[PDB]
Design an enzyme around this catalytic site. Sequence first.
Site, mmCIF file in Angstrom:
data_model
loop_
_atom_site.group_PDB
_atom_site.id
_atom_site.type_symbol
_atom_site.label_atom_id
_atom_site.label_comp_id
_atom_site.label_asym_id
_atom_site.label_seq_id
_atom_site.Cartn_x
_atom_site.Cartn_y
_atom_site.Cartn_z
ATOM 1 N N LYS A 79 0.995 -1.302 0.110
ATOM 2 C CA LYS A 79 0.002 0.346 0.105
ATOM 3 C C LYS A 79 0.952 1.298 -0.079
ATOM 4 C CE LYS A 79 -3.611 2.181 2.192
ATOM 5 N NZ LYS A 79 -4.930 1.957 3.725
ATOM 6 N N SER A 154 -9.741 2.257 3.043
ATOM 7 C CA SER A 154 -8.758 2.858 2.173
ATOM 8 C C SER A 154 -7.589 2.326 1.486
ATOM 9 C CB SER A 154 -8.025 4.401 2.953
ATOM 10 O OG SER A 154 -7.425 3.754 4.033
ATOM 11 N N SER A 178 -10.125 0.386 7.070
ATOM 12 C CA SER A 178 -9.399 0.516 5.726
ATOM 13 C C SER A 178 -8.641 -0.837 5.350
ATOM 14 C CB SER A 178 -8.289 1.593 6.038
ATOM 15 O OG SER A 178 -8.707 2.787 6.686
#
Lengths: 485, 410, 98
Positions: A79, A154, A178
Site C-alpha cells: 500500500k 482506504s 481501511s
Amino acid sequence: MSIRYESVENLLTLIKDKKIKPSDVVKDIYDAIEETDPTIKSFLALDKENAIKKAQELDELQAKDQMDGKLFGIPMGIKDNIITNGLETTCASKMLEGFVPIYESTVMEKLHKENAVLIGKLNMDEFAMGGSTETSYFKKTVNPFDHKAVPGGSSGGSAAAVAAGLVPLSLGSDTGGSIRQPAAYCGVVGMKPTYGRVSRFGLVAFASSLDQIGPLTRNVKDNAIVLEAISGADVNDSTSAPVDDVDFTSEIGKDIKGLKVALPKEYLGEGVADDVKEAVQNAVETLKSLGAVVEEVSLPNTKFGIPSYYVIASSEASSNLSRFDGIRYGYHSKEAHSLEELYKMSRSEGFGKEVKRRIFLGTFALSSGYYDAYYKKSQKVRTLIKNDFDKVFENYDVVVGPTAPTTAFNLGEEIDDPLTMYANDLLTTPVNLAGLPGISVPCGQSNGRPIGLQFIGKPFDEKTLYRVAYQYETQYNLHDVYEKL
Amino acid sequence: HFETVIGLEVHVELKTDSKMFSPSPAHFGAEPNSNTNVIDLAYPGVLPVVNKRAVDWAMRAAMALNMEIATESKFDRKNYFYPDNPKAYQISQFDQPIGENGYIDIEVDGETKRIGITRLHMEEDAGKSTHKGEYSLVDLNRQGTPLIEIVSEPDIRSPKEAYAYLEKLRSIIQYTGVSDVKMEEGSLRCDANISLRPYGQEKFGTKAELKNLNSFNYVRKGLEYEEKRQEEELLNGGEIGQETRRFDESTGKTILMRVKEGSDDYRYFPEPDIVPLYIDDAWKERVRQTIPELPDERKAKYVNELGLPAYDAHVLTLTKEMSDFFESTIEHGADVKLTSNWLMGGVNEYLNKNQVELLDTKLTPENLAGMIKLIEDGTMSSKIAKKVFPELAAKGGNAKQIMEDNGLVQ
Amino acid sequence: KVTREEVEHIANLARLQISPEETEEMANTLESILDFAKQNDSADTEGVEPTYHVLDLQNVLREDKAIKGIPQELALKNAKETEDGQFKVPTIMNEEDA
Ligand SMILES: Nc1ncnc2c1ncn2[C@@H]1O[C@H](COP(=O)(O)OP(=O)(O)O)[C@@H](O)[C@H]1O
Ligand SMILES: [Mg+2]
C-alpha cells in the site's frame, strides 16, 4: 499470468520443488499487471527492474538449493502509504509525488528478509482517508467483481490487485476498517492484527492510536502465513508489543466445536442492508452446522463507533500531517513570497479536499475551548467501546458479524457527500478503537458483489481468528471465482 | 515603588549521548544537517523513541530541587509550525511533569528566602534557523536534543534575587552532572518574566517575557532595566501588558517584539506514539541514590567541621568537580587551608590559561596532597612550589620526581 | 454556529490557505461534520476515563547509545529549495503582520 492465480502456499512449494523459476513467476506477475492493471488500476509506482534483478538472484539460490525464507520468491504488493526504500512513496497524494524515502519500513525490512519480491506500490485514498480510494490523486481503482463499483477504502488498491490476481499477497493499513472494509468489498481475505502486533515504523501515520498494518490474500491460510512474516516486536516502534509467540498457522485446520461465538445484535442492526444481513445469518448457521456455539450478545456502544473514530482520527491526523510543509520533502509551492505562504500554499496545493476537511475538523476538535467537548469526549467514548468487548470476551472466544453494512457501492455514488461515505465503517470502527484484531473473509455474494463476514478476537489471539475463520472458509469461499474475474 | 513579582524560565540541555527521542548524536560537528536522521528530519511515518538516561537524568534533577516526582507521567505534543521544528509539534509534557513543587533556598538582604519551583519537564530542543539575507537557512543538527524546563514559581522578588536563584539552580543541576549548565554554550537558558504589583495589589502585575538574556549578569540588567521601564510608565498611563520583549545587549534595554492577542493555542494533547511511563518506587530510589551531596550541605560541612573560611567554602564548592577533588586531597593528609588556596590559587590558574577541565589535567588528589605536605614539611619552599606545580599539574606524575628529574631539594 | 472567523482561525491554526468562496462553504461542511460529531453526546461518559493508549504496555525506553547521523546528502535529497547545505525557506516572517 500462468501462476498469476496460485496461492502463496502453492506458489511456494511449486518453487521449492523447482517446477517454476523465480524470474518466471516475476515474469508472470508483470504480464498480468500489464494486461489487467490498466482496467483495474490497483497499482501505482512499479518496480519491475529491481524485481527481475531480485528474481535473477533467487534463481541462482534456487539452483544452489539455498531457498531460505517464509516467502522465498513470492511476489508482493504494498500500500502506497508504507515506506518502501528507494521506490517512490506517495500515500496517493500530490504532496508526496516524487517522494523517494531514504529509510526502510520494518514490515519491508522483514518481508525482504523472507525473500518476498516487491512488485510494486498499491493505490489507496490520499493519506488513508476515505472508503472507496476515489480520492487517490493519481487514478481511480475499480472493483474486480464489477469495474463499475468502488473497491472500498482506504486500501482499495491493496484488495483490488489481490482480487484481480495481480499478486498472491499485499499489505494495507487499517484505521477505521481501511483493510477489512476493502477486503470485504472485493471478496478477499483481509486481516487487521492486534494493535501492537505489527510495527508502525515506516507507516505514514494517519491516526497514531489506530493505524496498524495488515495483509490481504486470496485465502485464510496464506493471510496467516504472511502475518507471521510481518508481526513481531520492533525496537523502532515504542508501541509494538513485545510479544514472542508469532505462530499463527499452528492451529489452522483444527475444529471449532465448543467455540463460544457472540453475535452482537448491533452488528445486524439497522445500518446493515438486507441481502448482507441474510448472508451473515446463514454464516451463523454454517457456523452452527460446524461445532461453534453462537449465542446473541450485546455491544451497546457500537453505534458510537464512526463518530468517535472520526474525531479521534481527524484530531490525530490534524497533527500527524502537519509535518508536511514541503521544506524537507514533498510539494513546494513556487509562488513563494512569505513564510506563512510557504506553509499555507504548499499544503493547500498538495492536500485534497477530503484530507483537508479532516484536518479542519481535527484542528477544531483539539482547539482551545472545544478540546474537552470533542477530542477528550471522544477518547472517553472509545473507553466505553473497549468495555463492550471486554465484558463479552469474559464469556466468549470471538465476535462475529458482517464486515460491512452493505455490498460495495458504485464509483461516484456516495463520493460527493462526506458523511455517508463514513457510514460504511459502522462495523469496523469499534475494532480499531478497542485495539482489537479483526479479520474479513467472504461469506456470500449479492448482485455479484461479495459480502464480508467478520471475526473480532481478543487481543493477540489472532491464531484463533484464523482458526474459526479457516473452518468457515472450508464451507464457503470465492477461491475458484477470481479466475473468471 | 511597587512590588516586582518576577520568575525565571531556565531550559537545560542534558549532555546525553543521543537526542531525546532519537538515536542521533547529541553533540554535533560544524557541518550543517549532518547530525540528523529520518526522525530529526520528520520524514513521513517515523516514530519517537525515548532516551532512557534522559528520563533518569531528568527525574534526578527534579529530586535535586526537592520536587515531587510524579508516579504516572506521559509526554504530550506541543503543536506549532516553524522551520526549526519539523514535526510541527515538539514533544513535551503538559499535565504530568516529571517534576513538581520543588524549591531552592537563596539568601537575600539579611536572611534566607525560599523560592519554590513549580515544575520541571522534558522537551526537545529545535533546529537552528540562520537568517541569511532575504531567505533564512534551516539546520536540524541540534533538533531533538533533550531539554528539561525549570519553571520557577513567581516567588523571586528582584533582579538581584533573580541572579541568586539562577546561580543556585545552575550550581545544583551542575552537581547532578546531567548538564554542563553553561549559558556561554547555551546549555543553560533563561527567559524572564517581570510585572509590577503596587504593594498590596493581589492580582499580579502584567508580565512581559524578557527574551535574549544570555547570562546571569545580563538577565540582571534586563530585569532591573525593565523593572524601571514599567515602574515609571506605571506613573504615566501605561500597561506594558501581555507583551513580549527582546533584550538589546549593547544599549541595555527591552525592545517590544509582539503583543499577545489572547493565549497561544498549541493544542496540547498526549503523544499516542509513546506509551506512558510508570515511575515505580524502585525507579525513584535508583536515581535517588545518584544525587551527590549538594553545595549548601557541603559548605556547611566545610565551614563548621574543617574549620574553613566561609568564602573559601564558597569558591571550593561552586562546581562538584573541584569540591570533590578538594574533599579527597584532604583525606590524603594535605593541610585543609593549604589545599583550599592551591585550588583557588595555583590550580585554578592552570585550568584557566589552558582552558582544561580539572580532571583532564594530570594531577590527582594524591599527587597534589603529596606536594602540599612537602611545603608544610619545609622540604619545599613556596618558591619551588610555583615550579613543581605547573609540571606536576598536567603531564606530570609525582611530587619529588621534579626535584630529581630536575635539580633542587632543600 | 461555526462562523467565518472560526473557520479562518482553524484554517490559520493548521497551515491551510482558504479564500472566501471556500470559507463560507467550509462554514457549512464543518457545521455538518460537527452536527454529526454531536452523536457522542448520547454516549454516557460520566466519570469514565478517556482512553489514551489501547495497548497497556509500559516503560519502553531506548538505551542511550548514539548512532551516526545520515549524510547531508540524504537529509537534503528530497527537499526542493536548498543552499550552503541547509533548507531554504522565506523569512520575511508572517504575511500581513510581517
Ligand atoms: N504577572 C507575572 N509577573 C511575574 N511573573 C509571572 C507573571 N505571570 C506569570 N509569571 C511567571 O512567568 C512564568 C511563565 O508562566 P506561564 O506563562 O504559565 O508559562 P510559559 O512561561 O511557558 O509562557 C512562570 O514561572 C510564572 O510564575
Ligand atoms: Mg519550553
